[PDB]
Amino acid sequence: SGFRKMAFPSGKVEGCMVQVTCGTTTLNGLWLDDVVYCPRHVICTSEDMLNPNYEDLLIRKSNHNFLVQAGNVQLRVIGHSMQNCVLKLKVDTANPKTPKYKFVRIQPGQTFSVLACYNGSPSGVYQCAMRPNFTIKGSFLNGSCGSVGFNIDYDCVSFCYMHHMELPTGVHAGTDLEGNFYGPFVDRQTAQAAGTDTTITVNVLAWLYAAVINGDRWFLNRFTTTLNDFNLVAMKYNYEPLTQDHVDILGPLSAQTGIAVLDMCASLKELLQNGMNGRTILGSALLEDEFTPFDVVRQCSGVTFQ
Amino acid sequence: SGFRKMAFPSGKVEGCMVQVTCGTTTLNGLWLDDVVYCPRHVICTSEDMLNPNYEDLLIRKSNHNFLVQAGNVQLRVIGHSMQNCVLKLKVDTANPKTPKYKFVRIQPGQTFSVLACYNGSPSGVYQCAMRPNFTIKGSFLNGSCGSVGFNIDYDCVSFCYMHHMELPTGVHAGTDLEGNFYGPFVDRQTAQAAGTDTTITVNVLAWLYAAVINGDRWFLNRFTTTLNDFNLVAMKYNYEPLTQDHVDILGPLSAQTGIAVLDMCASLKELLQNGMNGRTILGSALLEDEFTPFDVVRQCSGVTFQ
Ligand SMILES: *[C@](O)(C(=O)N1CC(C)(C)C1)[C@H](C[C@@H]1CCCNC1=O)NC(=O)[C@@H]1[C@@H]2[C@H](CN1C(=O)[C@@H](NC(=O)C(F)(F)F)C(C)(C)C)C2(C)C
Numbered sequence: 001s002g003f004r005k006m007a008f009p010s011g012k013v014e015g016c017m018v019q020v021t022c023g024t025t026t027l028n029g030l031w032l033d034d035v036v037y038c039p040r041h042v043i044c045t046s047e048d049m050l051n052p053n054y055e056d057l058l059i060r061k062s063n064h065n066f067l068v069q070a071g072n073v074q075l076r077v078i079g080h081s082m083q084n085c086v087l088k089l090k091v092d093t094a095n096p097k098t099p100k101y102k103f104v105r106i107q108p109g110q111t112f113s114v115l116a117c118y119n120g121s122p123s124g125v126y127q128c129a130m131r132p133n134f135t136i137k138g139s140f141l142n143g144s145c146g147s148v149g150f151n152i153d154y155d156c157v158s159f160c161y162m163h164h165m166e167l168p169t170g171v172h173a174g175t176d177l178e179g180n181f182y183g184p185f186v187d188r189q190t191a192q193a194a195g196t197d198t199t200i201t202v203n204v205l206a207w208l209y210a211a212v213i214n215g216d217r218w219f220l221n222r223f224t225t226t227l228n229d230f231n232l233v234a235m236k237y238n239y240e241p242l243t244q245d246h247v248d249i250l251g252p253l254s255a256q257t258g259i260a261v262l263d264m265c266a267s268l269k270e271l272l273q274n275g276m277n278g279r280t281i282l283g284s285a286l287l288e289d290e291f292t293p294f295d296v297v298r299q300c301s302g303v304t305f306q
Numbered sequence: 307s308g309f310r311k312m313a314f315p316s317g318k319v320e321g322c323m324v325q326v327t328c329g330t331t332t333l334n335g336l337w338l339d340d341v342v343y344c345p346r347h348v349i350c351t352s353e354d355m356l357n358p359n360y361e362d363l364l365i366r367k368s369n370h371n372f373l374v375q376a377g378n379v380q381l382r383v384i385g386h387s388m389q390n391c392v393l394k395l396k397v398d399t400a401n402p403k404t405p406k407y408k409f410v411r412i413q414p415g416q417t418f419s420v421l422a423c424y425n426g427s428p429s430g431v432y433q434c435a436m437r438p439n440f441t442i443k444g445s446f447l448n449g450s451c452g453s454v455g456f457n458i459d460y461d462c463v464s465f466c467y468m469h470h471m472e473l474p475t476g477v478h479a480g481t482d483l484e485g486n487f488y489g490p491f492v493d494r495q496t497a498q499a500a501g502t503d504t505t506i507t508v509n510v511l512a513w514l515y516a517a518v519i520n521g522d523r524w525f526l527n528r529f530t531t532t533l534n535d536f537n538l539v540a541m542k543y544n545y546e547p548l549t550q551d552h553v554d555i556l557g558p559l560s561a562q563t564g565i566a567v568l569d570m571c572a573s574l575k576e577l578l579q580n581g582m583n584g585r586t587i588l589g590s591a592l593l594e595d596e597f598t599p600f601d602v603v604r605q606c607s608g609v610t611f612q
C-alpha cells in the first residue's frame with residue numbers, strides 16, 4: 001500500500017549529463033550518441049541575456065569556444081548548429097551510455113521526472129506535471145539550465161523537457177528537445193508571466209481512485225451525476241472540462257475499483273462545494289492534480305523499467 | 307527557486323538490483339561485490355510466514371535452491387548465511403557496477419531515498435523519513451521486499467534500509483543492511499502495530515527556513531521565545547522536544563536567512579496555536595516534517611553527486 005509522488009529511476013539519464021561551458025557561462029548538456037544538446041543561452045553573458053541576438057553571437061563562436069566535459073574526460077566539439085532555442089554540438093565521441101531514447105513533446109496535463117543537474121552532475125530527481133499554462137513547478141537554481149525531464153517506457157527514455165528559465169511566482173519554463181518552448185515564453189530576460197493556471201480534472205479523479213485503492217473512502221457519496229452537470233460545477237472552481245476521452249482514460253481505474261467515473265465525479269463535485277472539512281485524502285489536505293491515470297496505475301499495479 | 311520533495315539519483319543503486327527466487331517466492335536483492343543481500347523470508351511459503359523457523363528452513367536449502375538473476379544473466383550462488391533478518395548469498399561473480407558504498411543505521415528523523423523494485427527491476431524512486439516510531443510511509447506492493455533505501459554522499463552510497471513488511475495503517479517496516487529491524491518489529495505474519503508517531507520538530511523548522519528562502523514569509527512574527535517555552539507548547543501538539551543539538555544543526559539555515567532559530571520557533575508556536583488559517587506554506591496546507599536541515603541546504607544550495 002501507500003501512495004507517493006515517485007519519479008522514474010534516473011540511471012539511464014545520469015549517464016547522458018555533461019557540463020557545457022562557453023566563456024564564463026556553464027550549464028548542463030545532454031549527450032546522446034555524438035550530439036550534446038543544451039540551451040542556446042550558453043553563448044550569452046549577463047549583458048547579453050536582456051535582449052540577445054543568438055544567431056549573431058553563434059556566428060562568432062568556433063568549436064573550441066565550447067568546453068564539454070563528462071566527469072574527467074573533455075569531449076572535443078567538431079560541429080555546432082542551432083535548432084530553435086536548443087544548441088546542438090557535434091562531438092568527436094559517441095556517448096557509450098546512450099540509452100534507447102526518443103524526443104517527445106508532451107501535452108498539458110502529462111507528468112514527467114526531472115533530473116536536476118548542476119555542472120553536468122545530478123543533484124536529485126522528482127516528478128512534475130506540465131501545467132495547463134505551460135509551466136512546471138520545479139526546484140531549480142542557477143546552473144540548473146539544461147536539466148531534462150523524461151519518461152521511461154520499459155527500456156526507452158522519452159525526453160520531453162529541457163530547463164531554460166524561471167518566471168514570477170517561481171514557476172519554470174522550458175523547451176522540448178527540438179528547442180520549441182512550451183507555452184508563449186521566449187529565452188530573453190524580459191518581463192514575462194504565466195497565464196493563470198487551472199486544475200487538471202482527470203488527474204484529480206485519478207488521485208481519488210488511488211485514494212480508494214489505498215482504502216481512503218470517506219468521500220465516496222452514493223450519487224451519480226452527468227458529465228454535463230459535473231463540468232458546469234467544475235467550471236467555477238477553475239477545473240478544466242472533463243472530455244469523454246478523459247472518461248475513457250479513467251476506465252482501468254474505474255474497472256479495478258468498481259466505481260463508475262461519474263460516481264467518482266459526483267464525489268468530487270461534493271468535495272469542491274463542501275470542501276474537505278478538516279479531513280485529509282492520502283495524507284493530503286488539498287486535492288492533488290499532478291498524478292495522471294497512468295501514474296496511478298503504474299504505482300498501484302507495479303509497472304517497472306529496465 | 308521552488309521546493310520539491312526530491313530523491314537522490316538512483317543510477318548507482320539500479321546497477322545493484324537483482325531478482326532472488328527461492329521455490330515460488332521472488333523478491334529483490336542487492337548485489338554488492340560478490341554478495342547478494344535479501345530479506346530472509348525469501349525461503350518461506352505462505353504457510354511458513356505465520357510463524358517461521360528461519361534457521362530450520364535455511365538448513366534445508368542448498369545453494370542451487372536460490373535462483374539469482376540480473377537481467378539476462380543468472381548468477382550461481384556458492385554460499386549462503388543468515389545475519390539477523392538478512393540473507394547473504396555468496397555468488398560466483400562480483401558485480402562490476404558495485405559503487406563505493408557503506409552500511410549505515412539511520413536515526414529517527416533522518417531521510418533517505420527508496421528505490422522501489424519489483425522482480426529485481428526498478429519501478430521508481432522517492433524520498434522518505436524514518437519516523438519516530440521506526441516506520442516509514444512508503445509505496446510498496448507485493449514483490450517490493452528487498453527494495454533498499456539509501457543516501458548518496460558525493461560518490462559513496464550509504465545503504466540504510468531494506469524493505470520487509472507492511473503494518474496496519476499501511477506504513478512500512480524494515481531492516482538495516484545488517485538485518486536488524488528498525489523499531490520492535492519481527493519478520494513474522496503476526497498482529498503488530500506501530501506506536502503513535504510524533505512530528506519531527508527540527509525538520510518542520512528546516513522546512514520553515516526553506517519557505518523563507520523561497521519568499522513565503524507571511525508566517526514570520528516579530529517575537530522571540532525560549533527553548534524551554536517552545537518545548538512546552540510543542541509538547542501538546544505531539545512534537546518531539548527540540549534539543550540544543552537541533553538548534554545547532556539549524557545554524558546554517560539561520561545564518562543564511564538571518565532568522566534566529568528562536569524567532570522561527572516563535573513563528574511555529576504561533577502556527578501551532580492559531581493554525582494556518584486557510585493559507586499554504588510552500589504549496590502545502592499542512593506542516594511538513596520529512597525534510598531534514600541537510601535536505602533543505604542540499605536543495606537550496608545545490609549539492610550534487612557523482
Ligand atoms: C539558467 O540559464 C542557468 O541555470 N544559468 C544561467 C547561469 C550561467 C547564471 C546559470 C537559469 C536558471 C534560472 C536562474 C534563476 C533561478 N532559477 C532558474 O531556473 N536561467 C536564467 O537565468 C534565464 C536565462 C535568461 C534569464 N533567465 C531567467 O530565468 C530569468 N527569468 C526571466 O527573465 C523571466 F522572464 F522571468 F522568466 C531570471 C534570471 C529568473 C530573472 C534566459 C531566459 C536566457
Ligand SMILES: *[C@](O)(C(=O)N1CC(C)(C)C1)[C@H](C[C@@H]1CCCNC1=O)NC(=O)[C@@H]1[C@@H]2[C@H](CN1C(=O)[C@@H](NC(=O)C(F)(F)F)C(C)(C)C)C2(C)C
Pocket residue numbers: 001331332333347355446447448449450451470471472473474478492493494495496497498
Ligand atoms: C514482501 O515479502 C514481498 O514483497 N513479497 C512476499 C511475496 C512473495 C508475497 C512478495 C511483502 C511486502 C508487503 C506485502 C503487502 C503489501 N506491502 C508490502 O510491503 N512483505 C510481506 O508480505 C511480509 C512478510 C510476511 C508478512 N508480511 C507483511 O508485510 C504482512 N504484515 C504483517 O504481518 C504486519 F504485522 F502487519 F506487519 C502483510 C502481508 C501486509 C499482512 C513477513 C513479515 C515475513
